Symmetry: D2
Amino acid sequence: ADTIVAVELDTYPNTDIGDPSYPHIGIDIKSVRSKKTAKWNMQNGKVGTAHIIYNSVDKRLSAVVSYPNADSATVSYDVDLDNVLPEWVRVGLSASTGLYKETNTILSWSFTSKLKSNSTHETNALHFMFNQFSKDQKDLILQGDATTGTDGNLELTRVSSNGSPQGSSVGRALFYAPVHIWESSAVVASFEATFTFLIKSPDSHPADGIAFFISNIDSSIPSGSTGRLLGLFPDAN
Amino acid sequence: ADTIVAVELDTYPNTDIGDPSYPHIGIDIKSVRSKKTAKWNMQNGKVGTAHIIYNSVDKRLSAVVSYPNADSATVSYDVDLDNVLPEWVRVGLSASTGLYKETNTILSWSFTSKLKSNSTHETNALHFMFNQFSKDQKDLILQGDATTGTDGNLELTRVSSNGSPQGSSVGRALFYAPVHIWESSAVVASFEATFTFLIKSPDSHPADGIAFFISNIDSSIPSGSTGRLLGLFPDAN
Amino acid sequence: ADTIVAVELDTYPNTDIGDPSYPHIGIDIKSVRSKKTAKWNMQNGKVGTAHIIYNSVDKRLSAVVSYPNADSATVSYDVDLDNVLPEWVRVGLSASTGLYKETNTILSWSFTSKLKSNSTHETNALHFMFNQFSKDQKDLILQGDATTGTDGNLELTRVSSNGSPQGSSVGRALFYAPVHIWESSAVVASFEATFTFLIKSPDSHPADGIAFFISNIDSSIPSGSTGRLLGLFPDAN
Amino acid sequence: ADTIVAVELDTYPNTDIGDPSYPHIGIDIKSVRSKKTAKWNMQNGKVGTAHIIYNSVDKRLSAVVSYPNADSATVSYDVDLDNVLPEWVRVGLSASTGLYKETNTILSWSFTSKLKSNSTHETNALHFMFNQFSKDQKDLILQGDATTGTDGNLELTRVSSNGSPQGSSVGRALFYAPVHIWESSAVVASFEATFTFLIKSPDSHPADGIAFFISNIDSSIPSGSTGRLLGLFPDAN
Ligand SMILES: O=C(NCCOCCO[C@H]1O[C@H](CO)[C@@H](O)[C@H](O)[C@@H]1O)c1ccc2ccc3ccc(C(=O)NCCOCCO[C@H]4O[C@H](CO)[C@@H](O)[C@H](O)[C@@H]4O)nc3c2n1
Ligand SMILES: O=C(NCCOCCO[C@H]1O[C@H](CO)[C@@H](O)[C@H](O)[C@@H]1O)c1ccc2ccc3ccc(C(=O)NCCOCCO[C@H]4O[C@H](CO)[C@@H](O)[C@H](O)[C@@H]4O)nc3c2n1
Ligand SMILES: [Ca+2]
Ligand SMILES: [Ca+2]
Ligand SMILES: [Ca+2]
Ligand SMILES: [Ca+2]
Ligand SMILES: [Mn+2]
Ligand SMILES: [Mn+2]
Ligand SMILES: [Mn+2]
Ligand SMILES: [Mn+2]
């Protein structure tokens, strides 16, 4: 179908598809089946920050989610992304809900990808940063339930006007421009993505999470991906 | 029609529309009629570098074209670009020929725009750099005669396979993503664009030039803009 | 008589040396008397942001001070800094109180310097940023009363443990490294600086101010410079 | 016994201290004997590029050396540098010859250091770049035989006016400022370095090599370090 690499933040365990029985962060390579996961003491109603980072050299893909004044969960998995991904991709943030529900507000999102070549400073590069989202973001492709303008914030999931979240929503947000993520002849290729989010839920149990993801250029939301699939994968299979 | 701000490099004087009688650089605000110009000792067959820079603070738009081991022509004109331009634009390089002809090879092109807001480091930003152009550039919108892949270079104007240029060509190249160039509430807005080019002509007199330009999102090439209009303006009027 | 260039922020108008009546920002090029100024609707106890930007192309030095939800005071002055300044400088911040007094608290400070040249981005550069000041900052030079570590802030003037400002206080903080501020052979020579500050006085009347300055590598506080001279100038010439 | 971490590039294998037979690159963590290495198909007289990249999340230090149109030699090592290194270091380059000798010419060198934290990009950072070395570089610390200004290059080992390398030579160059390399409270602590170099010997056999190193602020050349120790380590322990 469409190739998907993503870093997932399960607020909701899904022991039927494999997810551990605790709020976790994890690395998904073409399958909601995480190839590596780590325990995340999630904080309800607090603004937190995720850093994603990968370099050709280590071939190690990494992520750190962390709150102020709080321990930070980290995950790392050796993968070679030119085998996996197409030469041109498009990056973005995705998030969704199920029975249980949560606010998936993205307060800020940045990202940087460099292609340093065999001759140095013959590099190629793209960096893009949002610390507030305007009422109309010409350069974000918004998919599903995604809405901007609410308090200068990106809401990937749907929320009622009073501020309570709603269930069984998928919204997904993408950068307008395609990213040349890797090349046949580059000595180092790298890419970092940082984004801060606010997850607050009225219910004691929230669901399902946020994921930063990378896919081929022409990606649209999978049918019936609402819930534990996070708007990234069509099937747990 | 479509609003156009651009820095022009006339290799060919056009004294019928106003252009001075020497190879010049100049500032065009919605009219091929340059509002300020400066003398440029152009160098045939040598790689040269243009720097464009503008900040909300000075409200002064500036450009410098310069060769290695050679004097550098500079131009500057006070303009306030939120009055002129739409809130969202799209940037790019344009170039064309007439009776006389030239190669308009773009060896590299970068650009950066920042929106620092009334609260600091609540900024918004986009930077993008090409030091080589691949056979297929997914993220460049190519218009008219524009072609990439030839020796890792962007050729805005048409060129025969042996390497000689051809006449009465317009090619124009644009960044896929729209640039949020200014905002109603930002204490400093700024944007810098740098690009290196190679102009070589078999004929003693070459024509017409290269221009970096900014326009509304939906800009396409004007009809009959080939020649002294540089693929930017429909009429000298 | 070390050479010194600066962007000053006067909370105290010293009418005999030329300070306008109203609290102003100004450009001080080699003398305390400001070459140009602009009215500044200062806000007591609110954090503000200073932006400062100059480049070899415009040859305009300029600056904007700005509080949230309030107009921003701006100023510009056409000056060629390679005439005025040595080839190699140190950059830094200064502030001072006299009979009247204020809290000169620096919350954050960053600075960029590029020497782009004729070739394909064969430039020389330096950038540094502080959103928190550590308890021992060994890459700042601390001069006078200046202190770090309290709340992660830089305090250029002396304050009590309760927080009360003191009178007749003078403090400077310089980046440890020397900056290559201009070159004989570089086609453009941009440099940008940004910083935030907190100014609060119990008093009806606060004094004197903060200034971003640039001077020689060997620069030290001029004697008897507390008060009107902001730790910058020996005399009021 | 100053503390020191480094990425070494051996043209001369010193088999008794563990250098493999073949010319190698390696990670030297607190001792000259390399913790891990990889074969390097060195090219005489051709400029090459070294890339070096480490981050607190992976906790992997790694590096790639690369010539145009040739495979690139790579190496990695899992090490937690805040255990090994002091909180505040200086970075720099070192190289040396012994009985056998080579030209250790540094054409260009850049370095980035970020201390991203838990908050919304409230980080601390430093970046610097050199594509040309000036005649007097007063923000490099020059140690040993190291010299600037010849062709705009850095020469870490001594060379004649004709260009002939010399034997038993040792040279280091450090950035003037101290780097905050890690923090107790920072959630990630990335740092990246890049540099190009020219290595040429008249001989069949060249020696010894160049190394990027990190050490304490007060670090100076260890005595008797020419030859195998590359200006880095007092002893071969
Ligand atoms: O008004 C006072 N007693 C009378 C004489 O003090 C001069 C001010 O009175 C002014 O009005 C009087 C009435 O017409 C005149 O008789 C004076 O000749 C003067 O013009 C007086 C009473 C208490 C004081 C306590 C601590 C102090 C520390 C330093 C200075 C000083 O060196 N101060 C020197 C003089 O005071 C102002 C200088 O300003 C200084 O302090 C300012 C504080 O903002 C700075 O802006 C400025 O750069 C200077 O450093 N002063 C005091 C001080 N002065
Ligand atoms: O081979 C020579 N004459 C014989 C004795 O020289 C030792 C090498 O001969 C080797 O083989 C011989 C035959 O089996 C043995 O009898 C020796 O005991 C030794 O193992 C000889 C002839 C001329 C010389 C001229 C200038 C010099 C400067 C310094 C040194 C030195 O300190 N040199 C010390 C010894 O030479 C190698 C050290 O390598 C040094 O130089 C290398 C150059 O790459 C570095 O890699 C390395 O780290 C060292 O600094 N040597 C010379 C030197 N040596
Ligand atoms: Ca889940
Ligand atoms: Ca023309
Ligand atoms: Ca004053
Ligand atoms: Ca060796
Ligand atoms: Mn899952
Ligand atoms: Mn014209
Ligand atoms: Mn003043
Ligand atoms: Mn070795």
